[PDB]
Amino acid sequence: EYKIDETAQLSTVKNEDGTPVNLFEQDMVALRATMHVALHIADDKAFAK
Amino acid sequence: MEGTEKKFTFWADKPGAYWVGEGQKIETSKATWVNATMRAFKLGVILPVTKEFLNYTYSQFFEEM
Amino acid sequence: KDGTLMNEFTTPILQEVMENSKIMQLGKYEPMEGTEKKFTFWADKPGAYWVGEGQKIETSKATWVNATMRAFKLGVILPVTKEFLNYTYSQFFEEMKPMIAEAFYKKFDEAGILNQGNNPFGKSIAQSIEKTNKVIKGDFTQDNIIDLEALLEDDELEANAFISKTQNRSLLRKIVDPETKERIYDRNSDSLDGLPVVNLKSSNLKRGELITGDFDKLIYGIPQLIEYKIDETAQLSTVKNEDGTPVNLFEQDMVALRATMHVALHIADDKAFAK
């Protein structure tokens, strides 16, 4: 179950101004990841003379 | 059940174009009050009842009445 | 609200007549979207030792229509409080689905034959009859009915049975034929000429019978869907007045079943004259 805040207009039937619909249309996503830094990394970058 | 009980339900027709689901259902109830009572025997059967106790033929007539 | 209990609901001997009329029409159904027509009419030359005129006409016609059953609002709002208290309302909802399905077939027939709705729009039996102008003015006579039936068979394909609108059938039964035979009299089944006539209730149509044979009728499937989240508000009363439908589960389930119908133009119908 997912709710939309943008409320985009649809081609079929009359367009709705109000946010979120009862019928399923948008897919929910749940993923969490945290990264730790070692404070030591090599890097290379190009610079104009 | 005592008296009378009747129930009626009506459904509403839905729109052609798909946009919103229409509901609203009609309901009706019917009930009747007061029942008629049977009339009791009076002086007419009372004259025959005295003959029923004495005569055997009049006793069978009381049951048929 | 929900004070006195009635414990009664209306069922059968009403929806069965509407379902029988739709089945009596007979039409081919297809699962694939769209349609196709066949090539007809080609020019031929009569002149000797010459090629002459040579042209063949090709025809192609696609048909697609989407239908959806409307959900209740006014009656459904009262039913929501009764459903939690009584178990009979849940059983009544299953019977209401059958009535809504019968109304779905009735709305498709009324849009074409009676021109009440805009379901079919282009392919309508009443619209085709108005364009061709085959309808007879005034009251239909016993001798006039036989002449109208013979005129349709000469120009187009012959129809099996004419459509009845309840009130029109009663007026036809009173009239008697010129020969020694009863006209429009039903001993066991009602028939106009041979085949059994179908009775259908219509708001627009009141007087006059229309005869049609060839008619296309296609359906996607069965009208059944689960109810979730409130949508489309019209009338609601329980504790506080609301303009837009929100909160809780849906009061009435909205059913979706697509239906499409194509007309070949065969109906003539009859209309009463006014002075």
Residue by residue, DSSP assigns chain C as ---S-------SSSHHHHHHHHHHH-----SSSS-------B-----TTS-----B-----------BPPPPSHHHHTHHHHHHH-SHHHHHHHHHHHHHHHHHHHHHHHHHTS--SSSSTTS-HHHHHHHHT-PEESSPPHHHHHHHHHHHHHHSPPPS-EEB-SHHHHHHHH---SSSS-SS--SSS-BSSSSBPPB---SS--S--EE---B--EE---------S----S---SSS--SS--SSS-SSPPPB--EE--B-S----EE----
Task: Name the interface residues of C facing B (CB cutoff 8 Å).
Answer: 4, 6-11, 66-79, 92, 96, 99-100, 103-104, 107, 111, 117-119, 227, 231-232, 234-235, 250-256
Q: Is residue C80 within 8 Å of B24, Cβ to Cβ?
A: no
Chain C environment of B32 (Cβ under 8 Å):
none
| B17–A12 CB contact, under 8 Å | no
Q: What are phi and psi of C249, to 5 degrees?
A: -75, 160
Give CA A3 to chain center in angstroms: 13
Chain B environment of A12 (Cβ under 8 Å):
18
Give CA C186 to chain center in angstroms: 24
C-alpha to C-alpha distance for B15 and C68, rounded to whole angstroms: 7
Half-sphere exposure at residue C65, Cβ-oriented, CA atoms within 13 angstroms = 22
Mutate which of C229, C247, C252, C254 to disrupt the A interface (most A C-beta within 10 Å)? C229
Written as six digits, the tokens of B2 are 């005592």
Chains in contact with A, where contact requires at least 3 CB pairs less than 8 Å apart: B, C
| C71–B25 CB contact, under 8 Å | no
Question: What is the DSSP code (8-state) at residue B54?
Answer: H
C-alpha to C-alpha distance for C48 and C50, rounded to whole angstroms: 6
Closest chain B C-alpha to A16 CA, distance in angstroms = 10
Chain B environment of A14 (Cβ under 8 Å):
19
Size of interface A-C (CB pairs under 8 A): 9
Helix-strand-coil split of chain B, %, nearest 5: 30, 20, 45
Written as six digits, the tokens of C265 are 């133009």
Written as six digits, the tokens of C31 are 């699962």
Resolution of the solved structure (Å) = 8.4
Chain B environment of C71 (Cβ under 8 Å):
14, 20-23
